[PDB]
Amino acid sequence: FEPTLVVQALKEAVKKLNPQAQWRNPVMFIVWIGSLLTTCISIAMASGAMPGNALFSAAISGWLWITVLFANFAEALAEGRSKAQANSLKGVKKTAFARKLREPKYGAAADKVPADQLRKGDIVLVEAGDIIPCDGEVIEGGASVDESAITGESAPVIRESGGDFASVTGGTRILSDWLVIECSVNPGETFLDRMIAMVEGAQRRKTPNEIALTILLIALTIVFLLATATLWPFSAWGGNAVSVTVLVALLVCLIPTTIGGLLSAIGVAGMSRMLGANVIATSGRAVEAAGDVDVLLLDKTGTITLGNRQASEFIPAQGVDEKTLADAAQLASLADETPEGRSIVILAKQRFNLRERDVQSLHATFVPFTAQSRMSGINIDNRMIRKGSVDAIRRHVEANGGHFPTDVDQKVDQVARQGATPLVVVEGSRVLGVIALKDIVKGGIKERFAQLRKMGIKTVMITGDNRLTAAAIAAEAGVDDFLAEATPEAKLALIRQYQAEGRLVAMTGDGTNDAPALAQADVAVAMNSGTQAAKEAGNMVDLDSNPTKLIEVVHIGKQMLMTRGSLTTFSIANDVAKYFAIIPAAFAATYPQLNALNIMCLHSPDSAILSAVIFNALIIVFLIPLALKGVSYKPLTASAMLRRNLWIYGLGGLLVPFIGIKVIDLLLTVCGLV
Amino acid sequence: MAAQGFLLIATFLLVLMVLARPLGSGLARLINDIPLPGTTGVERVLFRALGVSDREMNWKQYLCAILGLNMLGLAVLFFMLLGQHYLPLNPQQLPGLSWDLALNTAVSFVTNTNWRSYSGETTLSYFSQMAGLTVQNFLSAASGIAVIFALIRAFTRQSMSTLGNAWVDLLRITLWVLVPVALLIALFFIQQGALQNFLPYQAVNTVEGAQQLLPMGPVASQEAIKMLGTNGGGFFNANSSHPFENPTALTNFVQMLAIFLIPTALCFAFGEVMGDRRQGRMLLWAMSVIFVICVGVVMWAEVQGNPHLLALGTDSSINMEGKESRFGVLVSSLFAVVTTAASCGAVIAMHDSFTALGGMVPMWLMQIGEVVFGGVGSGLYGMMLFVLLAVFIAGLMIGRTPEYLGKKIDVREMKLTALAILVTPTLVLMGAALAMMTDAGRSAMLNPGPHGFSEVLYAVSSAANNNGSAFAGLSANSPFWNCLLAFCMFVGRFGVIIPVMAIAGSLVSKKSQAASSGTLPTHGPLFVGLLIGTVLLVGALTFIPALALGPVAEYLS
């Protein structure tokens, strides 16, 4: 995140962010204007003018540009990590040619056409080796593709015609066979462009919480503009007027330059972590709303578990090789795109390097995972391979004239003791082995719901299982309550009843199955759907299709709200010490009796103002890692967090400027600079 | 001293709460459209006779009714002062006022400020004081209580678009709150020695050869309204120190209660209309804590007084220079804080002749926005602007959306409160900077040194915040100060009522929601301190430099 490689590539762009192109940021535009005249004066003041001391104003004006430079360094640093990830996926799609067929049938004559000229309705051919040029649906053929461009997983996934798996994403790479697809998205709306639209600027307006404090920051700079610009006529009457270079330095200090140069960097750094969690949002406004949620709802209907439990081990019972287990377990899990199914495909390549499979040579029909069957599988050979839970398979194995081996039942009971839900793979009527699905979360998943519980956010699981089996998964996960056998009308009743009690609701689910529920919800994350389903409803898209990803969505939005809240309290609390540094110094030549207010015992009036300007510039660099990494807050209620935020960032905002001005002033005295 | 100064504060606040508690119930009825006991049938006969139809008005209509009455008010008053020579009840042959004096004083009384760039007995006739100044002491006070009625309704009413009827409120406020109570207060003044007649000026042949001319007039009636309506405009040049307007120490204790009567009852009323009395008491709690500390500072500052008195061989260093003998040093010090925190402006003792600290607290309580017990409606919705700001920053640092009384504050409402807060500090800093750059402004001073700038800083601070108190050392009868201050008074009043009404109209269309995880208790000590810190820090960051060049320099001098 902070390599000398990228910093040098940004600091050059930081110095390029110094011209008259900051008028959209009112705080830094005033700092830029103050730095402009103080150099315009000090140059003319040194050459030939009435004022007598020019090196002091050149030192003040020098740090004023350093203040503007440091503010641009934060914005470029946040945009440096984002633009780097955007360019990594930007080159993935420009490497491609495109061959469009005259006749939709395979084997026709195709000519190479630029990829950007592909429009909706075109028919393009992609054989093994090439990358998918554009999105659309598969109309002919069937092959396994690598969607690492959009998910970061090298695990394969099948895309065949005439089924639920005909959705291909442009930018990904095909591996096994050939595929004929029909483009359905226009240029500029490709799935890769939406990731570009989320990272690049000019397409992300300010969020309500972002607009919130900006109104206070503009109101504060209006106060500090009137408070200092009127000092000149007030002081010119009692004695000699305060010099302009001091009025500028005083105004630049009091103006909230701390957050005015860090505010735009917090939003850019937060949206990057959003993409890091494989969640696509149309604008930053949605991510902020996830942090203001009082209750989040997790829909478990379309999957086995909550999505936290993923494949851990391959266990063969009797007379079965572990290699032949994962070889068939992957084939059965290829049609299971749920997190439980994807992990089995992932463990297939991690232990046995099962990366590609020639789909056409199999002459197979894939059985997709359904919640009613509680199992997925494949009919590759003359025998049928299936994979599901313990209850659904025993009804299927005994249906094929097969019995349950005693060793298999002993293995399933042992994995149940460990706390992992066991899945079984069966070829025809003979059991191959058991797959263990342990929890991935580093800490206890009950603690993540407990941390969410400490803050007052309630968690309710939505599922269609029985009232007895749903409570078991709810107890193993540590959620508050659950909704079993949930009809699409029962989900709307739970959301509306929560909203009727004044509670913002977040929900994750399927875009098609939970279409009416996600619309009524205040915050919504769509699973197992493309960007088109959510872009119309203004919802987020979960690329991993994990119901637990809503927890990370709320946490990312929370950090974006905590950093802004903690820095405003820290920055405003600095103004107490900043007044005790400039008021006795700027008025020492007009009313010397005000020297008693110089509590910090600063050396000279010119050294006092220099130390305040240096601290007004060095505090930005010291807070850049805090603004971009995020505040590590603790789970507390509303009123309890108000106190802790006032203790750490209120007293810290009070004592740090006191100690900071002294050390900077003492260093100027020891070094004897001024 | 300290024990008697403590009992003066305790007796004042105890008697205040005893009187303001039942009055808050009567004000709650007027907010709830519920008529007063005896005023059930008379309203129906009168409203139809006047043409008031009890219709409900939206915020745009409610605002144009109040602004319409005020713009009509100064139009009548400005012409009364120009044609003062023609109107009757003029024993002396006082001529019509100049255009700058008439414009300033007309804007003054409509604004509820009552600035005095003139000497009453020398400048005004009985008709202009009675048919012009008393009539405007009611309407300006009624207009203030009308605005706070609409805002309070915007918090209790749910999912509506109307704020009541302004004409019904302006009638109910004057006829059954202002007029009857002031009638009792004015009669008690007369008994203790106040002036109330229409006699010509009386000549007095003293026991020595000197002869003096006495000023008569209907003073007692106007005296009750200026204190109850927090107008502060006295019949004479010395308003509250004059023995004719405030004869005894007993009437003075009554005058101090009248300043705090209605603005305290409006807190008891707001707490009753909202059902939860705690929401009204915390607002009353945050104001009294700042009030008690301010009175203790000025008392200690004035008791220390001028040490040059002791160096020159006097009995004590007590600063009796700008004071009266009927009222003690503690009483003059208490009154000085009461009349400046509550925007009344009634001067019991010349604030210019106060000490460095004793004069800075009245200076500071005006610049702060007249929030601490701000007299007559203006102080309540002024504090409400900071309550919304305190709630806003509270949720801003927690990471949740703001929510006061269940209603969630949106961005548009925060733009109006912010602008409303910036109104008065913009006028004082720009207004003072203009005076310190003109010969007509600086030459109007009296005392030299930092105190001389304090005279200019106190004038524009009082005018913009509508307080009306003055050092009086500044001679502001020039057309420059009359035009400069009238601009600060006009914009400082209606420039805040307009966004307050827009805040009102924006809050009714919202429906209060139940408490969630992100809600914050707007009662108890934690929010009191958060409110106090919000009001103090805003006024501090705005006036700390101008005060350093003012009374702070005089203190360290």
Binding site: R24, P26, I30, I33, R205, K206, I211, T214, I215, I218, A219, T221, I222, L225, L226, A229, W232, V244 | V411, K415, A418, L419
Partner: peptide, 27 residues
């Protein structure tokens, strides 16, 4: 009025209107 001072007054007024305009909007 001095030439250097009157320009500084014009600069304050232009920055005031620029800030009041910025507070009304979301830029």
């Amino acid at each position: 009025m001095s030439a250097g001072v009157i320009t500084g007054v014009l600069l304050v007024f232009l920055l005031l209107g620029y800030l009041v305009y910025a507070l009304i909007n979301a830029e």
